[PDB]
Symmetry: D2
Subunit: 451 residues, 4 copies
Amino acid sequence: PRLRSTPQDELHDLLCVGFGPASLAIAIALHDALDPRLNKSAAQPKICFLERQKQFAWHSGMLVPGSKMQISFIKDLATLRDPRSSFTFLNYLHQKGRLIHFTNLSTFLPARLEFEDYMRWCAQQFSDVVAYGEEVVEVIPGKSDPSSSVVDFFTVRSRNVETGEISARRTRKVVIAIGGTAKMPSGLPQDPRIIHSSKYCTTLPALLKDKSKPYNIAVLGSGQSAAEIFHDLQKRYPNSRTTLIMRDSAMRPSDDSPFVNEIFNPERVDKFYSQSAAERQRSLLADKATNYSVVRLELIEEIYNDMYLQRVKNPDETQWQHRILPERKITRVEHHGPQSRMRIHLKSSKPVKETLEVDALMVATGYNRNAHERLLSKVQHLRPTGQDQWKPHRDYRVEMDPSKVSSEAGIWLQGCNERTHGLSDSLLSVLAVRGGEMVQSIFGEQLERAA
Amino acid sequence: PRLRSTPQDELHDLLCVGFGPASLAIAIALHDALDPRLNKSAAQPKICFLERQKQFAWHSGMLVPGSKMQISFIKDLATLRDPRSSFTFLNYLHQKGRLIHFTNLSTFLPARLEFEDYMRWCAQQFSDVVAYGEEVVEVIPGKSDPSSSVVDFFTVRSRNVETGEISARRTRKVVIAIGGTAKMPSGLPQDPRIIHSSKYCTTLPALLKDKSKPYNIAVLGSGQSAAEIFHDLQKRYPNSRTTLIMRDSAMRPSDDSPFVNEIFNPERVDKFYSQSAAERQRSLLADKATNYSVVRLELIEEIYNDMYLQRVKNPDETQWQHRILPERKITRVEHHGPQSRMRIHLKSSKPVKETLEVDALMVATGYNRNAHERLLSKVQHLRPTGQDQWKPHRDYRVEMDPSKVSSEAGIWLQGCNERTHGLSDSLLSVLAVRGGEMVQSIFGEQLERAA
Amino acid sequence: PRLRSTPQDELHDLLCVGFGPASLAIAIALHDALDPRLNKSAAQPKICFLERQKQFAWHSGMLVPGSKMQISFIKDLATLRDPRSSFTFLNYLHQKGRLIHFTNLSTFLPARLEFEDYMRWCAQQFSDVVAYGEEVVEVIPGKSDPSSSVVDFFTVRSRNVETGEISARRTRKVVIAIGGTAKMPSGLPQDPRIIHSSKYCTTLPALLKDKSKPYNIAVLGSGQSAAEIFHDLQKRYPNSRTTLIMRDSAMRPSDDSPFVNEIFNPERVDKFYSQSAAERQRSLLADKATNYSVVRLELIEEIYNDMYLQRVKNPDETQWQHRILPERKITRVEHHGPQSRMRIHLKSSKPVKETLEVDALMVATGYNRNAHERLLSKVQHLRPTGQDQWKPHRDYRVEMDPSKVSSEAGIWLQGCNERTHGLSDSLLSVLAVRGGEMVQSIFGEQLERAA
Amino acid sequence: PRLRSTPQDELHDLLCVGFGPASLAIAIALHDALDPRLNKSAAQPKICFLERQKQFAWHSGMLVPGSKMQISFIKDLATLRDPRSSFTFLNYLHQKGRLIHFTNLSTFLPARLEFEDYMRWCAQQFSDVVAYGEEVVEVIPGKSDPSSSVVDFFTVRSRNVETGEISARRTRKVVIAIGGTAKMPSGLPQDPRIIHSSKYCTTLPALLKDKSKPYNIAVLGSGQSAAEIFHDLQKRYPNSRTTLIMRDSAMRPSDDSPFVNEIFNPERVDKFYSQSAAERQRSLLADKATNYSVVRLELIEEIYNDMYLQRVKNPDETQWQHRILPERKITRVEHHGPQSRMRIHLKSSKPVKETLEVDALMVATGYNRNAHERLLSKVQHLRPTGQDQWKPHRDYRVEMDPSKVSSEAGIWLQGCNERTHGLSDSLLSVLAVRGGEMVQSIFGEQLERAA
Ligand SMILES: Cc1cc2nc3c(=O)[nH]c(=O)nc-3n(C[C@H](O)[C@H](O)[C@H](O)COP(=O)(O)OP(=O)(O)OC[C@H]3O[C@@H](n4cnc5c(N)ncnc54)[C@H](O)[C@@H]3O)c2cc1C
Ligand SMILES: Cc1cc2nc3c(=O)[nH]c(=O)nc-3n(C[C@H](O)[C@H](O)[C@H](O)COP(=O)(O)OP(=O)(O)OC[C@H]3O[C@@H](n4cnc5c(N)ncnc54)[C@H](O)[C@@H]3O)c2cc1C
Ligand SMILES: Cc1cc2nc3c(=O)[nH]c(=O)nc-3n(C[C@H](O)[C@H](O)[C@H](O)COP(=O)(O)OP(=O)(O)OC[C@H]3O[C@@H](n4cnc5c(N)ncnc54)[C@H](O)[C@@H]3O)c2cc1C
Ligand SMILES: Cc1cc2nc3c(=O)[nH]c(=O)nc-3n(C[C@H](O)[C@H](O)[C@H](O)COP(=O)(O)OP(=O)(O)OC[C@H]3O[C@@H](n4cnc5c(N)ncnc54)[C@H](O)[C@@H]3O)c2cc1C
Ligand SMILES: NCCC[C@H](N)C(=O)O
Ligand SMILES: NCCC[C@H](N)C(=O)O
Ligand SMILES: NCCC[C@H](N)C(=O)O
């Protein structure tokens, strides 16, 4: 099958906000559900994806040279749902003439560059139904009978990133799959020299143009992003003096041990979801080291080894080209001085220390997943009376007042539901299976008519 | 699609001798070629497989506990030809409800027990076209016009392993895929206590019945089979005294390094085949350590570690429970004595040493691949005049005198062609791709009519 | 030098309670301080060690086959203080004729069996100054002038483990290095079938005598001890049905990552000690995963793999020979029934489940380090007024009222000071350096006279 | 003890030619034999070492960034002889304040930079007895009674590398420990752009000065040196186009498997030496993959991975920045052209291909160990009549006619005796033990007088 485009003016069955991996997994699952080769029961649903980037890209600001996936390739966008799918990583390799060559690597962990290209190869097959350069700015409730008190569609308004014009599309069902936004410490001032990890590859080279210059560059944080940037900077700027600032005492290893890791299994979502709010909070805390503020062991070991080599060359740590400053917090940033370097004031992170002069501060402090709140502000009144937070059901559809919203209309959330669905929610871990679940939840009636 | 059985009395399009992995890969490729889901161009060919075992089994005498595949699961019976195939290892796992669980192991190397079950799961889907308990004993030339000098079919005669009756099936094309036979040193006498590695799991427990008894058991050889048996015996018979006898100075590691390993790539068969006899002989020798008389490093290290632990317990090697005797050869076996133990006489393997008294000698000396010669003795006269060896073309069809044999008739060899096709010939390495190549070579005309 | 014995009746310079690794490291450091070859400045101090075991043994109840050290051999009993010492692991190997052979293993982690033998080899060299089979039962204050209010020696009373007779030795200085006692859940009743991990190898075989019998054996806990026992039982009793009961959701991996692991460095003791009580408590919690309720990754992976193999054989987890039951707690133990099996009642560990019938319950719930409290009850009054807990100084000497105790008398604690000295206190990590520090603290005046 | 210098004019007991690791191990063993702390039996022997380098350096032309030892640190210059020695790698680390830090790396394989510094630290302690900048040019026989026919000393003549003046020293005993000389293919012409691997770090940067320039650089060979240079060039010159030319089909992995590796054990020298010439030749061939024309697996895998990444970026191998050209041999080098690039003509190495234009050719073709022949030309007549090759005894002393040479005079060879003493001869493997053996062989009489 081949998904054809729907004219902008027609009522859509589904409109998806964002075309990152989460939305792409839904597109793939729909294709597969409509394929007679895979689904024996298999008109076309009217679907559109809106993506603010001008083309498909996966965390392009963090495509650090040599960076690797932290998940088995088997957990791609189709395999766990159907290994026979044309959208598996192995079939992508076969199509590229690279399958035997990848096999000879004996690794489950492709370069992030390669995995992005896999997803790009998948994404390109849906170009007819994806509108790029469209930033969704609001979702507005709609009534086919404006005199009634029942909402039965939604209008999704997006802004063209190049022209700035506003387009509207109407749909019975909306999916919001917009990932996360850069989290910045509230104490830090705004400055072109202060840059979030998410914009590392895309904006730092424009600030620090000469790769041979002895720049002083600090990195704030101790998670995977902070470690990757710290390590890369030492290769990208060979004569630089880099400094890793962390409030913890040390970089800590990610837990990928097999029993613990079973929390990422697709079948575990049912189990997690059915737990109480207290139990879910308890569970997420207990398993935090699988995902948050943690670094892959291999990378920790490499950075440690690099530090040891500095010790061999010079026993005085204060003279090392690259340094780590643990149990520190930034208390003041001077950035109005005549020189191109900022002055960073540090204290102990325990409940006055040194001063650093730097050309740039990379801030690897993670992400927030609350941007859907702003997009859904105008539909908040459709929630049950007195409810001031969106409550996703197991099938990811948000709860709305049944007396206010028709059964045929709804809004689903994707990627922002860790609190209710578990640690796998924001990752690639369950995307293949979740895509299949989403297609059933959204298009079930049509698929049942064929079944 | 589903391959239906052909009545014994009808002329077959293809008859395959053996239903091990090589024949199974052909069955799978044919299924896939006939599947409209995978091949858009896709009556049924008349096909039968004859297998001497009573059911599908893969080296059952060597299904040693804990034994592992020495090849990536990606090199299964379909993936390298088509990752979308229902016969991939990953789809097998999915069907069994085990895919996520295998993923969590982070290994490319399943237990041999698991891989056999994968192949058994594949094999069971062809039960309608496989006759088990049928040992093929001869291939006889046939002439549709007996007064002419042109052969245009073959009669394949098989012996029922239970009843002993002789059945005949006629076919235009024959494939011989019968693997290897046990290679035994010519100096060794016949004795129930002298057993080839291929019969280890199936016959040794019948000889040495009490698992707690202090048996003396020797193992001859230094390849993967010898190492696996040596290591297993120490677990199976905890109180036994085992001795590894080898003519080499040491167990040597298998070469699985990535550049060298590319010799096993499916596309390399073309390159190898087109080389001269001298070059091919040279090439096979240079790369011998990838496959022959070699042990997986991990297993060498485990055995070595076990030996070290014996040293900790006792510094006198002569007192060790389990011993390795390198650079030795057996010169005499006494096995007519009144006691249940044989007397093995050893000398240096260099161009008189000790004596061992043992309850059993496991002989792990490898395999010969010449059994097709006996089966094809009655068709030898169809080869070009003066040719006293079978010459497989690139497509595995043996050369026959075109003035004696019709273009529609032929015999293909599988698994015994290392001399012409390379080190991957006897392994699982190229089976998926080779199956596809075989289906084209044998059924091409029919498939072209559909294409 | 060679430490000669002191007659029981003479006033000792030092008496050490316990001859485990901590006391042995002090003996070694004293030898080394007195050796002219190592210390250029170098009468004999009057010293005695009292050990309740009949000979040197290191956690003999947990010398599980195949069990390994969780610390580099470089952190032996001398190397970190002086690599030239005759008491290094490498010199032990050299003396045994095993150095080259160990080198060829390429491991930093010897078998626990080997490391015990290293320590036994060290211990045997101090046989003249160690009294075995002597259980210290009390430390009594002594006054050379009984009419005065100043304590200037201590009497250490011990009970002969064979004869039961009481011996007394007088000393100016005492070291208490008695390790830990078995920690048992308070809810469990006393029963010969309920056995702590510390008595696994020494007492379980006496209870379950027939190694081939299909016993049901449970294990309580999820730390290294629980994992080792769980794994071993499956080898020791091949036909048994084992069950691992844990309150956590999963076995979690030990953190041995290099930055975090620096907390075990000898120089870090100064840093840890100088922190506030609050900071120390915070620090110990943050780094808990380096030592407590954690399993070596390799062992987790092996157990996981064994579980997967059960899945291959049978997809129904309830039928598996060996099982893990996570998030469970024991609420009732029935052990008065006519059968030889106890009935264990389980519930969820979250704030009624199944029932198990077992022949034995192995309880791997860790250790307490409070036994010094009982031994020092009669000297408690020498602490500063109102102080109801022993307060070790940096040099491990407990604080006593200077107006009550002479400067030449004192009591040191070893191995029970994690709260004040850090996570390395109970381990082998800092023993070499700590031994040297202890010798200076205790014998400094004599050593200064030579210096 | 401290070895004092001998005036140039005095008769020496020993003169050693070369102060690389082999001579340094002798110096260390002598120190240790004379140390009362280690040898209880312990005037000073008159000794001098002559070294052509201006200071101690270990293969400085191949101190490639990130390069690692291929041998356990335990096989340092003392440990296998005496772990108590002050000259062990661990004691070096302790002295540098780095022991705990190295321990935390969990590696047996220090950087070559670190190991050189270890050896430099050892070497500096013998500065009084080492004359640097002295290139030995000949050994001349000497007779204390010139009218007699008996040689009883040797004169060693050396050339000052700075002034060019000739100095002579007289000695009863000589050791030649001069390592190897650069082996170059005889077909290659002399050119500043054609450089042996041994001069990579020291001379290539002087030829290719701009690290950012898009140079074309070829590497000839497929051993460890060729792989290290190939890999490093890609980092040193990021915009370069590198090409690895090899006559073999692939880089092959070094055999470091534990049983095979036992050939490097010090005790194995006795066993190897006592074999016949035929057996020794056979043995060296069988074990070639442990040392010659082989690459460490880890490095092969890294290079392979780098090649795969090029494939991801571009499926056309001809466009890759860095390429490997297997089964090739150089037949013509054009190097008289007006451009700065040479033209290299390649053919198949099998019994016309492409053309490469390159700025430099690195030639990693190994070493010869025959330079002692030139130095000993004037003493050849002292060998038994008709003997045209030097024959080292087990103790490394060359055979001389007893009627021509006094028992108190002799010449020993070190590092060039693989044919007679085995594969460990040229390596660090047996240096500690061999040093001890050499001290006994040379100074035994003096040491026996003390014993
Ligand atoms: C550097 C990095 C590496 C990672 N690597 C891994 C890994 O190895 N394995 C793993 O499982 N997880 C990984 N993750 C986790 C990651 O969250 C998932 O891989 C994945 O990106 C989640 O997909 P998503 O579609 O939910 O969110 P995203 O990938 O963020 O996609 C959301 C999309 O919505 C678009 N969008 C946002 N706002 C709007 C708007 N208003 N209108 C229109 N479009 C909009 C964005 O442009 C984006 O394309 C990584 C995360 C980071 C930051
Ligand atoms: C113990 C062991 C482990 C191995 N593991 C691996 C591995 O991990 N990876 C890998 O790539 N290679 C491995 N191999 C190599 C092995 O040769 C292939 O895996 C595979 O078995 C080859 O398949 P085949 O069909 O050519 O031969 P076989 O597997 O031997 O199958 C031939 C079949 O023909 C039947 N047969 C024989 N004679 C007759 C007759 N006269 N009439 C009818 N039927 C007959 C036999 O019963 C058998 O079923 C292993 C080999 C051994 C011995
Ligand atoms: C199974 C196990 C394995 C371990 N493995 C490691 C490892 O790999 N690495 C590591 O660093 N740590 C390990 N540890 C931590 C362990 O605590 C230390 O290795 C070490 O045992 C501490 O030595 P110690 O002398 O302080 O205590 P102990 O080893 O317990 O020694 C105390 C001694 O005092 C004796 N004693 C007790 N009471 C009396 C009395 N009243 N009178 C006389 N004598 C008495 C005891 O018999 C004992 O010999 C392990 C612990 C366990 C339980
Ligand atoms: C790049 C490289 C890396 C290696 N790494 C390892 C390793 O990891 N492990 C290992 O076991 N082996 C290794 N080797 C093997 C190596 O041969 C030994 O490590 C070691 O160098 C042998 O020591 P030697 O003293 O015999 O020879 P050399 O190290 O070559 O020392 C000989 C010395 O004699 C001097 N000399 C030469 N001619 C004269 C003269 N006419 N007069 C005066 N002085 C002279 C030289 O300047 C030199 O200092 C490596 C070899 C190379 C090339
Ligand atoms: N940060 C990525 C975590 C991936 C997870 N361990 C999984 O297997 O799904
Ligand atoms: N449980 C033993 C921990 C040992 C510690 N990682 C150390 O290196 O000292
Ligand atoms: N090329 C160095 C080889 C070192 C050798 N495997 C050894 O252990 O001595």
